[PDB]
Amino acid sequence: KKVLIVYAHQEPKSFNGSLKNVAVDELSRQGCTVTVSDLYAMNFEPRATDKDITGTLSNPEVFNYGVETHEAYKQRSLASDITDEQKKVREADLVIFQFPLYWFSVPAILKGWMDRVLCQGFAFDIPGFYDSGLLQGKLALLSVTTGGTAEMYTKTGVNGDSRYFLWPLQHGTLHFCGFKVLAPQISFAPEIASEEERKGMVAAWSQRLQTIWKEEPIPCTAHWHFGQ
């Protein structure tokens, strides 16, 4: 089995850093092939620009990012930073995203990875999405850490249920590209927690990873995210 960890945290000594490291330790112990894309260390480009296509454009007068990257993918003219990520995804059986929640979503550096790496022709097609998605047969998992407590992330809590913010990521992005979505790993408020509680959350993730290949994906539907 091959795993890609797309990691988005500035500090190796952080709780995010610890979750990424135990995932590497545990999956490596199992004999999996492991690759980590440490976005901040890579100074990963988040902006979707005309620099993402090398050589000449399909329409140089009117720049359309979607059209240009779709054509560049088919013509093998995408920037090397994008194709390097695409090769990692193409080979992966499982893609784990490790990140702190920023504004109920991914940090911009990781949003940039999604915007630029998951181009038409590679991840999805127009038309050719959801179960017609080009990353079918692959698994994806969001391992998120929050500032807010589990209680704040409930239906009647100030932030609403944690499943509400998962919709654009799990459904709009991952499911759209054909991934089977494994249940998210949500590590609530580690900064507020004790050293023992943090060790507990890190151990819970390592223990979950021991049987990750036996898991069934979630039914990635509106009912799962919002229903009763």
Place this chain on the structure above:
Amino acid sequence: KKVLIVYAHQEPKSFNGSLKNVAVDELSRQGCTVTVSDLYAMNFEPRATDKDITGTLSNPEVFNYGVETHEAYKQRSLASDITDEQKKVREADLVIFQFPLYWFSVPAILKGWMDRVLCQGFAFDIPGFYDSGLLQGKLALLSVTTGGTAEMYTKTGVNGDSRYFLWPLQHGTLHFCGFKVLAPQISFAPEIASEEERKGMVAAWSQRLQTIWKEEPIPCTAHWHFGQ
């Protein structure tokens, strides 16, 4: 009245470009004070890094972006690009976000604006969020364009209701910072539409802007976004 348009599109000749320009035209005609932050033209930095603080870090051994930027805001040691955006937001009565929908969310360049500009001490505090957010008294409006049709963005459609993807932006971000949220302007599938239909969508936005100051904000709640 003072308006800030935070604009995220690479192409001035685009439909997004047209929506931004008619907003400038109409608001300027009304006599409003108008400022546009054209993120791609500014090469706006989306990454949340240690480069966003120029002074002595509160903890140089373990970098915590949230803590460091909160302190840097209070000390006036944030990078000038952040400070420049904060001044525009501080003076604005209304903040319009003009952008194409990328993965059920904002393009990464605009996610970066939210991550870096809306720091603790400026946009919110603990306590001092949601109805007590520091941007209370201000209005915010999302003017979004999509690839998907209105029909795809319905409860029984493949993408689910359009309100579902608005939650992290409207509630998790804007309402969290104390903004009152005006109803979104969603311009569905302009690329698929005819030249006449595109003119119609641009005119509908210009027409709506004529009476924008008379609008009441939406009740930015879980019920509004998801029903029941």
